[PDB]
């Protein structure tokens, strides 16, 4: 026997549903997820790393003029300064006053730090759900991992479990996304070969291991000060180690619908957005025959005191009368309130309890022991504690209407302006049928 | 459960007073004042002999 059903897409708060296969006892599994992953497929765009800028030693050349060459470096700039006077520490390097040439030149370079330290700007195309759940089986706990595309269908104790597929599309990132090392930004990277100097990109490269390196950092070489050898520039700053300062706050900590964030492979747990489609496939070893399952006569329930507190703070207690011992199933026939119980042992003349949780602050619904329903109500009172660390367990109040008993005052006065209306309208009527009579 | 509750300042007489809360069977405090102090601050003034 097959079962399909769907429950909401929130980690960590369990739900009951209910197996009514026809000619036999009703069974109620209890099923609950674990985590819930989306791990898109990346493409990596380019790497960012902090440059090194390569100054060979300067070519100073005496009584002559040196004369600029050319080569396809990645940010290669090259310049002639005439008039120079260099001084080493002996005394002039040139022989003359004047007539002297620098041929400073430099370019820039991937640094030995891209191995380890570099930002990775990928590309994300798709998610690819995969749940883990764990769903109480013949009052057993037995946890079942697959993917959730609604396909690869997954088989443990005799049951085939097919989850998904995913009821929304949403997911945290974007289109384009960075990873530092362990935090992902949802940030819009300029294209390879096109980055701007002194911002995220100044310097891009294939693969960390590539030898290919676009750098665009506005070198500009500058006259060295008189009586000096040395080489001055000008170059804007690295501008991944200005990200690195500027970052913001990742993925983790701003990402919506309570989000969390891994890394190798990128991934997002715990969305809580929409729904799961969930179809279970069970024996017909599993199931039992109506005739044979106990049954349940003379039901009276009662709520010694209850609280709609969002962590099961009520209490029903019930009596009922059974034909035989055995196993009985639970289950409550009204969305508002939830029962922590699933199964329950009958015997004999005696009594049960059962913990729910609603939201109702007047608590009035059906519950379904084994093949026999009864009837069962009472006024909730509110609770005390103004925050807690943990969900609602129960669903919504409700979508509509289920304002409490005592809406009764409510009843009176409309029932008071309705009679005073029927009886406005039955004059009018009356006076109006004596007016059309007379002529 | 904080439970304020008031009872008349005659010593030697118990009062009941009833706690009662939600889930939980109603509890009695059987209370009784055995002594009241009211102690003055005293300034002296001057001692006489
Ligand atoms: C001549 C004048 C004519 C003028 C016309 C007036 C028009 C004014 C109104 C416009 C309507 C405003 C609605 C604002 C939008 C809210 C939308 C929303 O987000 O809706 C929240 C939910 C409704 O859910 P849904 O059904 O739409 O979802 C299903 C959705 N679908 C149906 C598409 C599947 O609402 C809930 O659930 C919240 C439940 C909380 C219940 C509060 C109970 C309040 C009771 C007070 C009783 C007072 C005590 C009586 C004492 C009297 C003693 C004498």
């Known amino acids: 026997y097959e079962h399909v059903t769907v429950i909401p897409n929130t980690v960590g708060v369990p739900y009951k549903t209910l197996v009514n296969r026809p000619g036999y006892s009703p069974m109620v599994l209890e099923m609950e997820l674990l985590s819930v992953t989306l791990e898109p497929t990346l493409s990596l765009d380019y790497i960012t790393c ?69 930002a990775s700007a990928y590309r994300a195309h798709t998610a690819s759900a995969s749940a883990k759940l764990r769903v109480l089986y013949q009052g057993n706990n037995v946890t079942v991992s697959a993917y959730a595309n ?129 179809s279970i496939d069970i024996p017909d070893a599993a199931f039992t025959r109506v005739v044979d399952a106990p049954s349940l006569t003379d039901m009276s329930c009662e709520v010694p005191a209850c609280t709609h507190s969002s962590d099961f703070g009520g209490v029903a207690i019930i009596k009922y009368a059974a034909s035989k011992k055995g196993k009985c199933a639970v289950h409550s026939m009204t969305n508002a309130v939830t029962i922590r119980e699933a199964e329950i042992e009958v015997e004999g003349n005696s009594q049960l309890q059962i913990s729910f949780s609603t939201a109702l602050a007047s608590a009035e619904f059906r519950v379904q022991v084994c093949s026999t329903q009864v009837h069962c109500a009472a006024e909730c009172h509110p609770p005390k504690d103004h925050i807690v660390n943990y969900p609602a ?32 309208a039955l004059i009018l009527i009356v006076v109006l049928c004596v007016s059309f009579s007379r002529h």
Not at 194 to 214: C, K, L, N
Not at 231 to 244: E, R, T
Not at 402 to 424: E, H, P, R
Request: aromatic share 10%; glycine share 8%; with cysteine.
């Open 150 to 278: 609604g396909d690869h269908a997954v088989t443990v104790k005799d049951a085939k479990f097919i989850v998904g597929p995913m009821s929304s599309a949403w997911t945290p990132f974007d289109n384009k996304i960075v990873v530092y090392k362990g935090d992902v930004y949802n940030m819009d990277y300029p294209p390879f070969g096109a980055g701007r100097p002194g911002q995220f990109g100044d310097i891009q490269s294939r693969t960390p291991e590539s030898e290919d390196v676009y750098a665009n950092t506005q070198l500009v070489l500058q006259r060295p000060s008189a009586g000096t050898v040395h080489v001055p520039y000008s170059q804007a700053p690295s501008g991944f180690k200005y990200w690195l300062k500027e970052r913001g706050a990742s993925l983790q900590h701003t990402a919506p619908f309570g989000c969390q964030i891994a890394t190798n492979p990128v991934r997002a747990m715990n969305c809580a957005v929409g729904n799961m489609p969930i």
């Open 393 to 424: 367990s129960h669903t919504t109040l409700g979508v509509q209407d289920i304002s409490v008993t005592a809406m009764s005052w409510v009843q009176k006065i409309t029932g008071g302006v309705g009679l005073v209306v029927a009886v406005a």
């Open 50 to 118: 902090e440059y090194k800028t390569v100054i060979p030693s300067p070519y100073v050349k005496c009584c002559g003029t040196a004369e600029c060459k050319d080569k396809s470096l990645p940010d290669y700039s090259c310049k002639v300064f005439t008039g120079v006077y260099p001084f080493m520490w002996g005394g002039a390097y040139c022989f003359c006053d004047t007539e002297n040439t620098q041929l400073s030149e430099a370019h820039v370079e991937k640094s030995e730090s891209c191995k380890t330290e570099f």
